Design a protein around this ligand. Structure first.
Ligand code: MG
Ligand code: MG
Ligand code: MG
Ligand code: MG
Ligand code: MG
Ligand code: MG
Ligand code: MG
Ligand code: MG
Ligand code: MG
Ligand code: MG
Ligand code: MG
Ligand code: MG
Ligand code: MG
Ligand code: MG
Ligand code: MG
Ligand code: MG
Ligand code: MG
Ligand code: MG
Ligand code: MG
Ligand code: MG
Ligand code: MG
Ligand code: MG
Ligand code: MG
Ligand code: MG
Ligand code: MG
Ligand code: MG
Ligand code: MG
Ligand code: MG
Ligand code: MG
Ligand code: ZN
Lengths: 101, 218, 51, 216, 129, 149, 83
RNA sequence: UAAAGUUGCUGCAGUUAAAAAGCUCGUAGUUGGAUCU
RNA sequence: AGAUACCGUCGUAGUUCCGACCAUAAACGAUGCCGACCGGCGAUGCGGCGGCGUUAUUCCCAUGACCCGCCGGGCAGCUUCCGGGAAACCAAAGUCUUUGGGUUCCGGGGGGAGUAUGGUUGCAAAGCUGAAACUUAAAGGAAUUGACGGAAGAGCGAUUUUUGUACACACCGCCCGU
């Protein structure tokens, strides 16, 4: 019984895809199958923003951002709840979740 | 006492439709069981083919229901089949009889060789499918009889076929699928375009269109 | 059953595109005086930007 | 119109169509709605041939008139834009209107209160009145639809290529269909314009109702 | 590669007949195909057809009447004696009241009944009913 | 599809229905034949001759004008190569691949392509032996191939 | 249809689709029998005569009943030739 | 022996029930486009 | 409890390159290749063709970047009562009792067993070909309702919070090897 038409990966018209290492557990997982996440955040948190803006020597100094690319295997993605199981009909929907308010 | 709830029933009760072939010509669905009783009447005989217990697993235990298979026919060109599931056997049998006489189709009968007298066999080879079951009917010479399994033979006799050869493939131990496949094969006899049906069709007034003024009154 | 005094369809001038005028002409209706031909939009950009 | 001069389209009808925008379609085209289209202009809008629209409307009127009992025709609208037009058409012609929701099993479940056995069905939109269309296939019911450039034609027998998005266009189409049916019946005449104007069939849009309420 | 032309033509005709089409285009043409279509048309199964003549192998446009249930080819072309014809009739035809087997004999391309009348055998090409 | 590739392309030429020489063409059959002879003496294969005639002199099809094909005209005149041009090109390509491969021992793809090319050469040589264009002792050998072309 | 004596032996003669010539069976509930009215060429009113078409459910499911009805009406002269 | 369309030429199967060679080339074998009254 | 495991510290062959062997993978789309026909829709990669209009090459064509289409091969996607199928699903897994386009390999209830033996290849490990005696009434596929979890009108038919199941005497289950 096939669960998915694409076999859970994004490989089409090619034979081999080089593996990467899970950020959490360092497992080898093919790059097309891995769960990718691009994280752009602030170096300083919300309270730290107000605590730092007063102690800075510059005027309206913009705090730098952190850019990180994260790769997860299926087990770590499910365990960390960045990915959840869906219904048989809801599996097909591949629209990203509505994070934009 | 019968009080029809549809236009067709009101027309039939008021003696506006002469035969069931008038209904069959326009492919009008039949929703009232009393129409078939009105037309075919006493010539209909039915037989229970199988009583099948089915079970649904629940928290307290299995829940059992009984499914009845009933075949009906007048042995003179019409045949029907019905399946009904209920808590009691008698209720399931009554429902199956009603559902079987609701879905009654006419049967076309032909000749094997020289066309002398009344038709006795199927017009040509006809195949019916249900699940994995495939049933094939082949014309047979006069006096041959029905060469088939016990289950198809009852339906073929009720349809009015005298002679026929039969082939079957698939899991025929499934009595419901075995009966439905041969019922489908029988039903396909009037839907086959033979060269003697090539004439252009002359249309006629529909019973709804013909008796609209009488329907407005009632 | 509210009815206005005048029809909203009644217009002294109705604007049409040249293609609509040609379609009317093919049906021998190019003599209408209420028609006014408007310049079509120069740029053909009617699709949502894929992304 | 079998090329008869009496049944030809007049200038006033063309002006009404142009004002209502019935000749304007969508950006998408159905592959079975392509014989009624004329040409795709810039901005992707498809233009509808009004002569074929008139021919289809006349064919639909001929189909409707052929039914003896006028009450055997059912006219159904689900969107709010067509409800008033359908009610006015039923009042002027004698058909049976279904405005708002269509209850499943109306044509099939014979023990329901609203069970009906119409001989003809007219709908405002195949994509919005799909439920009445589907139940027609169960009881041998012919169907007439007011289709658009992108509209499925399954179970649709007579398709009238109009614009069914705007309220003005829908009201005008229903008004013209009623007028043609009445003129073919031999009730009103073709020598003088009809007494009722096509604005009675338009959608009220309660914003317009509030605006007119405070006019005086 | 394409190794049988009559097979492709008959398969195309059958597929177009199932879909309710009014006309079929079959290419390439062949005089065997023309003879087969003539045999079919004499009995009223297809109707008139027109041969489009390009300078390479031709094409045919065939009108359809809706009377064709099945047209098929037999491969390989088996030799049929006049005493073995009834077995092929039983195997391939739906009834004894209609249907035809098409044979190529030394007299020409004909149906099985015409081959019985002329008392000759041949090779089976196909059937239609 | 291709004999030795999975590709299934459809690109080719489509000759017009009419076989009559166009009115504007002023050339006669003899002038076309003289042009063909001069081009052959210059050292051009029939394919190149046809390309040149099509591009420059407005000769769409020599067989339509002169009634004969380029190779048959050359054979009648006697200016025809000993072995056919397509086989010559196949052998030349095989020689080029074999010369490359001797300096690059680890190029397995070159070995695969050389096998394919030599298979095509064997097919064409057998066909030409069947038609007696080649003597029934002609053999393609890798050592002899350089001298052959 | 009939025996050697010529007597017709059938329950009924089914009607065929006007579009595809297929037989419309007794349980084909998606089939339609539609009438199109005829008008007088002088006045344009309802003559009282009509033309009957029958379409099977297979064509209707294909979405081809619109074109078939249009062509049938054109052939009978109901629809203008310059449609 | 039939039942066995469970040896299938008529007439079986090969995604998940038993099953298509890891891939390509290639001799023998099998098969082979129109056209001549 | 016990760890000869999972966890952590080191660490030998190996992991890297050259030359000779080995020919095995869930080497998978678990789906042989060639050819024909049979529904729509929107994208995408390569080549070509046509066409308003924005940009760069200071001007001009012309060539690049966009925009709107058409054709031909290619990797795929959505939809459909085309038709199939036990179903899951498949525009091929369709055009099959209305059974024949060409051709190659290959299966015949579950174990014994890919084991013994013979042959052959290899330095070895092993690769290819490949049984029988005997034993057994089922093993197995798809889907449904329950029970568990150290998880969050429509269907042939049973039948009509999500999810997994080899459980159904229903985890107090079933089951593997000494
Ligand atoms: Mg791999
Ligand atoms: Mg993934
Ligand atoms: Mg059994
Ligand atoms: Mg090859
Ligand atoms: Mg090329
Ligand atoms: Mg035996
Ligand atoms: Mg047998
Ligand atoms: Mg057989
Ligand atoms: Mg088997
Ligand atoms: Mg397997
Ligand atoms: Mg493979
Ligand atoms: Mg060979
Ligand atoms: Mg030949
Ligand atoms: Mg360790
Ligand atoms: Mg370490
Ligand atoms: Mg292996
Ligand atoms: Mg894989
Ligand atoms: Mg495999
Ligand atoms: Mg493309
Ligand atoms: Mg590319
Ligand atoms: Mg391009
Ligand atoms: Mg077969
Ligand atoms: Mg075994
Ligand atoms: Mg055993
Ligand atoms: Mg029920
Ligand atoms: Mg049911
Ligand atoms: Mg699991
Ligand atoms: Mg699983
Ligand atoms: Mg379960
Ligand atoms: Zn991980």
């Amino acid at each position: 019984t096939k669960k998915r038409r694409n076999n859970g990966r994004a490989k089409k018209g090619r034979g081999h895809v080089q593996p990467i290492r899970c950020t959490n557990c360092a497992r080898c997982v093919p790059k097309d199958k891995a769960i990718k996440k691009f994280v752009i955040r602030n170096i300083v948190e919300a309270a730290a923003v107000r605590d730092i803006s007063e102690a800075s020597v510059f005027d309206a100094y913009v705090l730098p951002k952190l850019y990180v690319k994260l790769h997860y295997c299926v087990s770590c993605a499910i365990h960390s709840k960045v990915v959840r199981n869906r219904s048989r009909e809801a599996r097909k929907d591949r629209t990203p979740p509505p994070r934009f308010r | 006492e019968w009080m029809p709830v549809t236009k067709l029933g009101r027309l039939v009760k008021d003696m506006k439709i002469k035969s069931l072939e008038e209904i069959y010509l326009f492919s009008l669905p039949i929703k009232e069981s009393e129409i078939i009783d009105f037309f075919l009447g006493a010539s209909l005989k039915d037989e229970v083919l199988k009583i099948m217990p089915v079970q649904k697993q629940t928290r307290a235990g299995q829940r059992t229901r009984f499914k009845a298979f009933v075949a009906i026919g007048d042995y003179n060109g019409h045949v029907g089949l019905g399946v009904k599931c209920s808590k009691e056997v008698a209720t399931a049998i009554r429902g199956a009889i009603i559902l079987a006489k609701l879905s009654i189709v006419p049967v076309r009968r032909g000749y094997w060789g020289n066309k002398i007298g009344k038709p006795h066999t199927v017009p040509c080879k006809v195949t019916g499918r249900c699940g994995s079951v495939l049933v094939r009917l082949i014309p047979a010479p006069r006096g041959t009889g029905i060469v088939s399994a016990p289950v198809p033979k009852k339906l073929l006799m009720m349809a009015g076929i005298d002679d026929c050869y039969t082939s079957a493939r698939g899991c025929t131990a499934t009595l419901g699928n075995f009966a439905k496949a041969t019922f489908d094969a029988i039903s396909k006899t009037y839907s086959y375009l033979t060269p003697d049906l090539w004439k252009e069709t002359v249309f006629t007034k529909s019973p709804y269109q013909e008796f609209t003024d009488h329907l407005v009154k009632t | 059953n509210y009815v206005p005094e005048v029809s909203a369809l009644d217009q002294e001038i109705i604007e049409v595109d040249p293609d609509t005028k040609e379609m009317l002409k093919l049906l021998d209706f190019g003599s209408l005086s209420n028609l006014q031909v408007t310049q079509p939009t120069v740029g053909m950009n009617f699709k949502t930007p894929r992304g | 119109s079998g090329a008869l001069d009496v049944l030809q389209m007049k200038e006033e009808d063309v002006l009404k169509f142009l004002a209502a925008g019935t000749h304007l379609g969508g950006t998408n085209l159905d592959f079975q709605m392509e014989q009624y289209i004329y040409k795709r202009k810039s901005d992707g809008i498809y233009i509808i041939n009004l002569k074929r629209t008139w021919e289809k409307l006349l064919l639909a009127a001929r189909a409707i008139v052929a039914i003896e009992n006028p009450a055997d025709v059912s006219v159904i609208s689900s969107r709010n834009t067509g409800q008033r037009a359908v009610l006015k058409f039923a009042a002027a012609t004698g058909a049976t209107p279904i405005a708002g929701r269509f209850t499943p099993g109306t044509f099939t479940n014979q023990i329901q209160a609203a069970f009906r056995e119409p001989r003809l069905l007219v709908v405002t939109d195949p994509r919005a009145d799909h439920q009445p269309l589907t139940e027609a296939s169960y009881v041998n019911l012919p169907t007439i639809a007011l289709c658009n450039t992108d509209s499925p034609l399954r179970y649709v027998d007579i398709a009238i290529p109009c614009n069914n998005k705007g309220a003005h266009s829908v009201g005008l189409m229903w008004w013209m269909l009623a007028r043609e049916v009445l003129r073919m019946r031999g009730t009103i005449s073709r020598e003088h314009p009809w007494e009722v104007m096509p604005d009675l069939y338009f959608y009220r849009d309660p914003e317009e109702i509030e605006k007119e309420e405070q006019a005086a | 590669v394409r190794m049988n032309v009559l097979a492709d033509a008959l398969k195309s005709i059958n597929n177009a007949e199932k879909r309710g089409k009014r006309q079929v285009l079959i290419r390439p043409c062949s005089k065997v195909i023309v003879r087969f279509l003539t045999v079919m048309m004499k009995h009223g199964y297809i109707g008139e057809f027109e041969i489009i003549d390009d300078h390479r192998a031709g094409k045919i446009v065939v009108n359809l009447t809706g009377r064709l249930n099945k047209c098929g080819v037999i491969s390989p072309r088996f030799d049929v004696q006049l005493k073995d014809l009834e077995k092929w009739q039983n195997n391939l035809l739906p009834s004894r009241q209609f249907g035809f087997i098409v044979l190529t004999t030394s007299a020409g391309i004909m149906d099985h009944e015409e081959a019985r009348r002329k008392h000759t055998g041949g090779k089976i090409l196909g059937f239609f009913f | 599809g291709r004999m030795h590739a999975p590709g299934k392309g459809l690109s080719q030429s489509a000759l017009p229905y009419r076989r009559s020489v166009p009115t504007w063409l002023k050339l006669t059959s003899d002038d076309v034949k003289e042009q063909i002879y001069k081009l052959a003496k210059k050292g051009l294969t029939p394919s190149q001759i046809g390309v040149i005639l099509r591009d420059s002199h407005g000769v769409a099809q020599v067989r339509f004008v002169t009634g004969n094909k380029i190779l048959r005209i050359l054979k009648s005149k006697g200016l025809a190569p000993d072995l056919p041009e397509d086989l010559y090109h196949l052998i030349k390509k095989a020689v080029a691949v074999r010369k490359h491969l001797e300096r690059n021992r680890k190029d397995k793809d070159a070995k695969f392509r050389l096998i394919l090319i030599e298979s095509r050469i064997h097919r064409l040589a057998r066909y030409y032996k069947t038609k007696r264009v080649l003597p029934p002792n002609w053999k393609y050998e890798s050592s002899t191939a350089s001298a052959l072309v | 249809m009939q025996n050697d004596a010529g007597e017709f032996v059938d329950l009924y003669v089914p009607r065929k689709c006007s579009a595809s010539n297929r037989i419309i069976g007794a349980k084909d509930h998606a089939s339609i029998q539609m009438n199109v009215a005829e008008v007088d060429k002088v006045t344009g009113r309802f003559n009282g005569q009509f033309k009957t078409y029958a379409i099977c459910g297979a064509i209707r499911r294909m979405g081809e009943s619109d074109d078939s009805i249009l062509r049938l009406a054109k052939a009978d002269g109901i629809v203008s030739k310059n449609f």
